[PDB]
Design a protein around this ligand. Structure first.
Ligand SMILES: CNc1cc(=O)n(C)nc1-c1ccccc1
Length: 108
């Protein structure tokens, strides 16, 4: 439905909000694969995903429903959990943002 997708746009807007910015910012745009320490990112992560790409996909009607949108949000988090050591600060930030997402996605 149009309504399901409108709710998805609302979840993504909250993920971009000032309230969550302290932990959401690494997910706003594609990972900078030219940064020092990120030389192997593309060899490990086959399908990079970020919040701006998801926003563009919603705008271009690339999701048929909420499950397709949710799969891209979860892909973004799973890339973070796969690539980094489990004790990395970015993994803790991904979990805080995933808490926001899962609670809204469950209640939509
Ligand atoms: C190890 N660095 C990262 C791992 C990761 O999973 N995400 C999402 N971002 C980063 C990152 C953050 C700032 C600058 C460059 C990369």
């Amino acid at each position: 439905h149009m309504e399901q997708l409108k709710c998805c746009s609302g979840i993504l807007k909250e993920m971009f909000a000032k309230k969550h910015a302290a932990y959401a910012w690494p997910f706003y745009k594609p990972v900078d694969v030219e940064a020092l320490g990120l030389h192997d990112y593309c060899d490990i992560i086959k399908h990079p995903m970020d919040m701006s790409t998801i926003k563009s996909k919603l705008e271009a009607r690339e999701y048929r429903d909420a499950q397709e949108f949710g799969a891209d949000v979860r892909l973004m988090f799973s890339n973070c959990y796969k690539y980094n050591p489990p004790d990395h600060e970015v993994v803790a930030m991904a979990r805080k943002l995933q808490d926001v997402f899962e609670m809204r996605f469950a209640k939509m």
